[PDB]
Design a binder for these strands. Structure first.
Ligand SMILES: [Eu+2]
Length: 601
DNA sequence: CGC
């Protein structure tokens, strides 16, 4: 258990000043903030907690306001006394997801510096797939300690209390323990993080520096036109009605556009071959085969897609606009993917269809405020260039070197013919091979994407490996070190542990082998993208130009740049992205601009 | 992930 005896509750300036003096001389100290909401931009600071040493932590309530709440130091007085310490780059801080804490302080004109250790990121760099990297999971994993849960003090359901409604002492037990546990977690993980220069490098120079830039991107938000979004919605309703009619008109009667129920009773009952097509799916889509000649399955295909899109983005996005800023603030996750790439939610910017006309209309709703323009900076096929570097292949390297289209260059070599004459079907075959290799695609999966028979796909792969020998070496060498040491690394030293590499189970092990080939390339892209963000944000912070970094999705960074400064700024972003990251992989940055995200894209 |  945890009583009111463990940690102290600071209710007076004199005691707060005694603690600030102790904090000033501590080598590092843990700190956490408590608020009345998860929404960073509109949340109010309810209190703060600190920990100077294991077992020694305190809670400073500043805004609890339930009926008859005891006097507390005022939020303004507490912050002005704490400000010097918080803004001191030399006073080192530890915390669980400091991104959140940095933002809250920003709501009060305070610039959190000394953002040295994030236990969430410590855990993530040590072993990204060890489990969840939230504090409750961390405490139980590294300390066999079960923390007080937020529900334990606030409750559940709609009648859950906000932090300011909880009693001083209850709040104190919770907040002070977090600070305490965080420091203990750091003390256990920080030493471990040094047994290897790779992970240590990524944590120190990539992850940690990225904490404040992610906070700034999240707090900046993105401008979204709800009118455009609504037009699109109304139109889609009309297109869904029409499409349904087109389906009915083709056969007879009414029905759901649900397979293995209403479709099979129609489609194969009027000629075709029995099996269905799962919405397993990105390998066998029976419905889009028939689509090249058959009309019905083609309309059902396009119907489902528009249905998904409308409810996921057209109807959701407008509801995500924040009343305080009038912008949408997406949640970026730094410690979630196995490979190290950032992920996104509310909205999940990465699920907006790219090569689909409708997804483009979603992107047009992402606009620039008056006098500004949206600028998109993207790393052209970064993972493909990374694979070229990793395989040391002179052919692939030279293709990128002389500005030729790698897919046409690849097909020119694989099919043995002039570059100017390679056909679209040949370029399409080479493209499938090139991207298949990055995911470690089996010679049969390639056959299912290209629609060619098995062994005809194999015929192509053998010709590829013979023309580009260095790629097979990489594949073999990577599957080798994966078994020998249970993990693979990126160019910067980031690791992906593969427990199922010697699984003794068939497919469970196959998966581990696919991850072995893929992760080094995907993780390296992520490391590169993270370094560009840090580099770009540094310039932004020092030079103060008229530009905001507003998004990060796939291999691109999106900004809002003033119309009168677009040229000078584009020159600068470009140089930062293709020169101040890794000097080994041959990188190319495509910069564009427009009135909205789709125009610059 | 964070209250
Ligand atoms: Eu907390």
């Amino acid at each position: 258990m945890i009583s009111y005896d463990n940690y102290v509750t600071i209710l007076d300036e004199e005691t707060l000043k005694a603690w600030i003096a102790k904090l000033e001389k501590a080598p590092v100290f843990a700190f956490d903030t408590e608020t009345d909401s998860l929404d960073n931009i509109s949340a109010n600071l309810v209190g703060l907690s600190f920990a100077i040493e294991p077992g020694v932590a305190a809670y400073i309530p500043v805004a609890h306001d339930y009926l008859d709440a005891p006097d507390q130091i005022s939020r303004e007085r507490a912050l002005e006394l704490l400000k010097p310490l918080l803004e001191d780059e030399k006073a080192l801080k530890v915390g669980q997801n400091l991104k959140y804490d940095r933002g809250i302080l920003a709501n009060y004109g305070i610039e959190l510096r000394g953002i040295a250790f994030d236990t969430m990121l410590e855990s993530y760099i040590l072993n990204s797939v060890a489990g969840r990297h939230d504090m409750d999971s961390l405490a139980e994993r590294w300390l066999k300690h079960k923390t007080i849960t937020f529900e334990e003090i606030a409750g559940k359901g709609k009648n859950q209390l906000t932090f300011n409604q909880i009693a001083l002492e209850e709040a104190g037990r919770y907040a002070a323990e977090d600070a305490d546990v965080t420091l203990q977690l750091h003390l256990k993980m920080w030493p471990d993080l040094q047994k290897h220069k790779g992970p240590l490098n990524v944590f120190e120079n990539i992850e940690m520096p990225l904490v404040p830039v992610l906070s700034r991107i999240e707090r900046n938000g993105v401008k979204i036109d709800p009118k455009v979004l609504h037009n699109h919605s109304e139109e889609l309703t009309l297109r869904l009605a029409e499409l349904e009619k087109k389906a009915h008109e083709i056969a007879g009667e009414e029905f759901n556009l649900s397979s293995t129920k209403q479709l099979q009773t129609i489609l194969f009952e009027k000629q075709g071959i029995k099996p269905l097509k799962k919405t397993p799916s990105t390998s066998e889509e029976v419905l889009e085969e028939l689509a090249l000649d058959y009309p019905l399955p083609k309309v059902i295909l396009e119907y489902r897609g528009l249905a998904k899109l409308k409810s996921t983005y057209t109807d959701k996005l407008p509801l995500m606009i924040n009343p305080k800023t009038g912008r949408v603030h997406t949640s970026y996750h730094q410690a979630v993917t196995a490979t190290g790439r950032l992920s996104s939610t509310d909205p999940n910017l990465q699920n907006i269809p790219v090569r689909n006309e409708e997804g483009r209309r979603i992107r047009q709703a992402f606009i620039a405020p008056e006098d500004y323009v949206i600028v998109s900076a993207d790393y052209s096929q970064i993972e493909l260039r990374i694979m070229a570097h990793l395989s040391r292949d002179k052919g692939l390297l030279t293709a990128f070197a002389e500005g030729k289209d790698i897919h046409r260059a690849t097909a020119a070599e694989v099919f043995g013919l002039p570059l100017e004459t390679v056909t679209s079907e040949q370029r399409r075959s080479a493209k499938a091979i090139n991207f298949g290799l990055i995911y470690g695609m089996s010679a049969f999966g390639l056959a299912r994407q290209l629609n060619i028979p098995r062994k005809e796909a194999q015929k192509y792969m053998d010709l590829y490996f013979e023309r580009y020998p260095g790629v097979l070496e990489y594949m073999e060498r990577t599957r080798a070190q994966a078994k020998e040491q249970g993990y693979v690394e990126t160019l910067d030293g980031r690791r992906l542990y593969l427990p199922d590499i010697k699984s003794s189970n068939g497919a469970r092990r196959a998966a581990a082998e696919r991850a072995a080939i893929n992760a080094p390339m995907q993780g390296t892209a992520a490391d590169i993208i993270k370094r560009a963000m840090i580099a770009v944000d540094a310039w932004l912070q020092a030079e103060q130009p008229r530009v905001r970094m507003i998004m990060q999705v796939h291999d691109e960074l999106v900004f809002e740049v003033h119309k009168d400064d677009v040229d000078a700024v584009a020159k600068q972003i470009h140089q930062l992205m293709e020169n101040c990251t890794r000097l080994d992989v041959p990188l190319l940055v495509e910069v564009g601009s427009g009135e909205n995200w789709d125009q610059a894209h």
